[PDB]
Design a binder for this molecule. Structure first.
Ligand SMILES: Nc1ncnc2c1ncn2[C@@H]1O[C@H](COP(=O)(O)OP(=O)(O)OP(=O)(O)O)[C@@H](O)[C@H]1O
Length: 337
């Protein structure tokens, strides 16, 4: 709403409106519609074909204000647009189209050709957000109208399966509205209005949006199975690849604290290729999905070793010991976060 329209867009948006309307009825001509006083599309007749003046004026202002809304959305999404040259407005180049195949209205639709114009990948990402916003507008309007999502379409109960997020929308509708708004942007460029799409802004939510404040769950064996001497081994399998830590913990490990933050646990974070005990040090490489991590402790000479898919992991130096020396204490139990 707060978007203000620059004077040249104010000059140009009306002719964009009726030019894309003539285009738009050319699309329904491709679909096979013909002009008729009746509204029913099933009998192939629809009065949207004729020019804007003889169009139902409520459909006319609907099309006009949706054109303005689309260009204001272009403005609001941070995509600046300039004027290429006065030649783009001076020229009125036209494709020849047979009158019988064209509409009844005298004003002949076809704009400057699509082949001459080129659409950049940034420009296509732009019309992606345009289709997103158009779908949101349609959904919000029907929601104030009272319509509600339903798997089976029901006009009587105002239930429509198309009231879904655009990422979840059906590919047919996505491609249809994508191409319509794409061709609208194509005409915008054809009138010599080069819109400079801003570069994609790198924003990562980092998966942190977990349900409730629970950030990680720690799984450990019972404190009674603590080992105080000998050689021990167990395997940890990574179904996914992500923020996990595996290793050995003392009976006093706190469930709320992360493994390796304090002295109670000795862990290996392969997601960052990071070893953890009272801090983080670089050790080993990163795992992928399906990798099996072998955790070995020798509690006679107080060493710990890790293997990823069989090969022994190494720290920055050539040493194979994740933790070279540590006290016996109360023992160690397998643990994973
Ligand atoms: N004649 C038209 N006038 C205005 N918008 C139209 C017209 N035809 C299609 N649209 C737009 O394309 C969408 C496709 O609608 P659909 O294929 O169900 O046919 P429609 O009966 O013309 O639609 P609607 O009554 O919702 O405008 C519509 O929701 C609307 O946004």
């Amino acid at each position: 709403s707060q978007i203000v329209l620059p004077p040249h867009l104010e000059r140009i948006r009306e002719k964009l409106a009726e030019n894309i309307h003539e285009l738009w009825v050319m699309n329904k001509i491709e679909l096979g519609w013909q002009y008729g006083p009746v509204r029913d599309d099933n009998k192939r007749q629809h009065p949207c074909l004729v020019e804007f003046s003889k169009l139902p004026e409520q459909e006319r202002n609907y099309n006009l204000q949706m054109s303005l809304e689309t260009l204001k959305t272009l403005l609001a999404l941070g995509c600046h647009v300039g004027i290429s040259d006065e030649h783009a407005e001076d020229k009125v180049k036209k494709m020849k189209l047979p009158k019988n195949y064209q509409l009844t209205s005298g004003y002949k639709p076809a704009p400057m050709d699509l082949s001459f114009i080129k659409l950049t990948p940034s420009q296509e990402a732009m019309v992606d957000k345009l289709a997103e916003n158009a779908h949101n507008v349609w959904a919000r309007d029907r929601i104030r109208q009272g319509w509600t999502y339903g798997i089976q379409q029901d006009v009587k109960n105002r239930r429509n399966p198309r009231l879904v997020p655009y990422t979840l929308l059906d590919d047919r509708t996505k491609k249809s509205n994508k191409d319509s708004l794409r061709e609208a942007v194509r005409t915008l460029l054809g009138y010599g209005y080069n819109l400079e799409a801003p570069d994609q802004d790198h924003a990562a939510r980092a998966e942190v949006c977990s349900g409730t404040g629970e950030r990680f769950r720690i799984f450990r064996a019972e404190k009674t199975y603590a080992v105080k001497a000998g050689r021990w081994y167990f395997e940890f399998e990574t179904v996914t690849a992500g923020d996990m830590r595996v290793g050995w913990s003392r009976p006093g490990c706190q469930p709320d604290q992360e493994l390796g933050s304090d002295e109670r646990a000795f862990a290996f974070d392969g997601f960052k290729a990071q070893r953890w005990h009272q801090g983080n040090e670089h050790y080993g490489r990163s795992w992928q999905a399906g990798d099996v991590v072998g955790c070995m402790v020798d509690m006679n000479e107080h060493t710990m070793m890790f293997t990823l898919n069989g090969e022994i992991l190494l720290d920055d130096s050539g040493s194979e010991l994740a933790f070279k020396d540590f006290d016996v204490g109360d023992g160690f139990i397998p643990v994973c976060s």
